[PDB]
């Protein structure tokens, strides 16, 4: 079960440049995995970051784990990011005003490990998942819009996936509707928002080393690494990378795009 080692390195000084120096950034899905490694990557990069997820000691533990480093600053926000009073309560008690907000979060539902097939679906699974992965990214978005608009400032990179794009077996189809809303969802969002300087842009990983994903089936992952061109599983940290760079001076006149992060995985 090979699979080929890393081979673009960041020098230690140019991974931690202070690119995202006063800068506050709200992360949803923050706690863990790929959105764990996002809110890292900001605070490599001098950002105030909003640990958005569910369960408050969850995220007050991975806030520890970020404030260790002495880099940016974490800050908890507990709260179900599919319930905007909740959200806007949550972001209120921070006291900080977000100029940026990266939507991570979302969620995949299996059945003893597999996706359920549409006419297998129940409308219940499909309803929260619309909810947490399409509504939850509205939410963000219209809490912090007003702000944006009246600042003529302001970042949003929103995650679709490959499969959104192009039909991948691995999930249900709750999961590729809610990724394929967000690519003309960004669109959209990108022209409404552009008058005022703000760019909004989305990732679309492909199969990423998380907890969840590494844990499965040898076999599954190596036919994912199979399907493959780059011959491995990304990393979170690349997935981060990309957000750090959407939200970056380095890419200031691209909006509306959705760039997957996918090593060649299921390109469309």
Not at 135 to 150: C, D, H, K, Q, S
Not at 198 to 215: E, K, Q, S
Request: hydrophobic letters at 45%; glycine letters at 8%.
């Amino acid at each position: 079960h090979h699979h080929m080692e890393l081979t673009e390195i960041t020098p230690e000084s140019l991974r931690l440049r202070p690119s995202h120096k006063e800068r506050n950034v709200l992360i949803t899905g923050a706690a863990r995995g790929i959105g764990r490694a996002i809110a890292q990557a900001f605070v490599e990069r001098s950002a105030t970051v909003g640990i958005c997820d569910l369960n408050l000691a969850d995220v007050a533990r991975t806030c520890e784990e970020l404030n260790g480093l002495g880099l940016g600053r974490a800050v908890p926000i507990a709260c179900d990011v599919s319930d905007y009073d909740a959200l806007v309560a949550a972001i209120d008690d921070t006291g900080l005003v977000f100029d940026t907000v990266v939507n991570n979060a979302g969620i995949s539902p299996k059945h003893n490990g597999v996706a359920h097939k549409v006419w297998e679906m129940a409308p219940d699974e499909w309803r929260r998942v619309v909810d947490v992965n399409l509504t939850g990214t509205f939410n963000t978005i219209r809490a912090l819009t007003p702000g944006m608009v009246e600042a003529r400032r302001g970042w949003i990179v929103n995650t679709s996936s490959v499969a959104g794009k192009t039909y991948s077996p691995i999930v249900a189809c709750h999961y590729a509707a809610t990724k394929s809303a967000i690519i003309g969802f960004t669109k959209h969002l990108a022209a409404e928002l552009g008058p005022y300087s703000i760019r909004v842009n989305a990732m679309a990983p492909g199969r990423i080393a998380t907890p969840m994903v590494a844990g499965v089936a040898p076999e599954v992952n190596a036919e994912q690494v199979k399907l493959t061109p780059m011959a491995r599983l990304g990393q979170p940290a690349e997935v981060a990378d990309v957000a750090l760079w959407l939200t970056s001076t380095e890419s200031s006149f691209v909006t509306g795009q959705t760039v997957d992060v996918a090593g060649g995985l299921y390109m469309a």
